[PDB]
Subunit: 115 residues, 2 copies
Amino acid sequence: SKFYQINTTLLESNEAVNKQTGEVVPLSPETKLVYAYMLNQYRMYRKYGNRRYTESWDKIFTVCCDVAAQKQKRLAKELTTLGLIEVIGNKNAYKVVHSVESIIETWEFTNSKLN
Amino acid sequence: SKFYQINTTLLESNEAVNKQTGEVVPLSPETKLVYAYMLNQYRMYRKYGNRRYTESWDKIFTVCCDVAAQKQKRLAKELTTLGLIEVIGNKNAYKVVHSVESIIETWEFTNSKL
């Protein structure tokens, strides 16, 4: 395939608000592209031998962005805070990409700049 | 639509280099998102019977990012320089969205890091 898919809600939103706590998580532009890439990769790992997704954050950010290490950590933390990416394990760690659909009971995506 | 599409080359590249002039256009993340959005919007305008895609740059930038006026001007310039967007008129200006494939004879996409 010659295209990645960018989730409609994510593209059109600049933040997510926790429905239980009110916490506000800004959504950065890089995060949206990183999510699109990881979703595709997760699906490719599944298709090609049904492997769990273990691509390193470093490799992921090298493909999608050109940012400082400190920034990369912030962007990765947006993803994990929202639950779009779930890191499971420590010794045999892997990454699970979750749909936006699956976290809406917890996170309400909005665009505070639209009147 | 449930999702917007972004060309593989665009997502995986951090710069475009003009094959004839050497000019380099770094590909900001916002640029990629704005392009994906505008490509779909252009398609929807045409699907609903319109010849022209007339959404304003201000509305476009409001939906896709949260950046200051000067940055929006520069991001729009990244797009017009590449020829991915062609702008016609002053106020109420319509925008023609071209494919990445239509510009590769002029611009080479790369990821120096990758």
